Amino acid sequence: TGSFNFGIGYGTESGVSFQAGVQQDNWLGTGYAVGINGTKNDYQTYAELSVTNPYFTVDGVSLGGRLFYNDFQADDADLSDYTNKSYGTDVTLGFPINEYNSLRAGLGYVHNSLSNMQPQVAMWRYLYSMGEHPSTSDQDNSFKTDDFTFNYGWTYNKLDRGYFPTDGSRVNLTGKVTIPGSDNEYYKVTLDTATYVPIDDDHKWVVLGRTRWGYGDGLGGKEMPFYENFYAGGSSTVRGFQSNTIGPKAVYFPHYECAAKDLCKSDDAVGGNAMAVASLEFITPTPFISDANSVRTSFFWDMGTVWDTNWDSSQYSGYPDYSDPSNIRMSAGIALQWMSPLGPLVFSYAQPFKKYDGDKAEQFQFNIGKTW
């Protein structure tokens, strides 16, 4: 039988987030679950239709297909401004390799429609690599791409439990590459790791080591599109830094504003094609409470960097070298997690004790319910 649902969450990364969907297992007896879902937050609106058979084979090889659209407003994501309205479709085979490992292979089509781009160097350098030459003096522009991708995934999951894990690791590797026929020509790889090492026999004292790695680049003379950039900074990556602040900052053309007869530095983040995060976090028994097993308290050390491997310092000797990977940001702080009656809740307070020019601080961060 089927169901419908709606949800509200809230966080510093997203603002208020609304979800709603209808779902039906085994729709019309086809063996496919069918879902229609939408999600909206301060900067994004997304909807999809999914059709999924978890037992495409009797061994639990899964087949899924989706249609989707997306409206993304970069300025509301604390980035330099552009609008990206896209849509597409994908198909994914899910392979259970063993208890701890699954693989994913998929093909995807996506149409990206970029407009309202505030002219800036890194963005225009991408556009030029694409043979596109919009004016640098206004925000009236349009740039459209159609891409076909091969999508791959590997998930390793050997956590003792999913709720407040005390032992084991989770690794997620995702890759994609354009297929000939695409407008864009690039690959992109992401790697997430979390490893929990319990110190005491009761597993109330736990060390979490967390990493994130992102690398993408153009094949041929084309660059990875900026709309596929990685970011860092925020409640879920590097605490104490404003959402997405870490890494290159927009260098605007005469046209934070630059409205000026010269190029203008800014503190608007643009992301980059390379990113790395690492975090060490000590989980301790929750102080001045007792039961205590419904709260998780922790102290952490967070670090991260984002860079632009195609940033051309020689031409722009007067500006920060945004191709430099070594501007490692760091913060220290405390966090609390709790299954609140409004849903899963996390709070953190963290001071960014290493930062660079244009980086913005956000000491107090939180997230309540689903914002993902």
Binding site: G2, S3, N5, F6, G7, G9, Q19, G369
Partner: peptide, 7 residues
């Protein structure tokens, strides 16, 4: 929070 109702 998420509310979910079957039919």
């Amino acid at each position: 929070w998420n509310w979910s109702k079957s039919f």
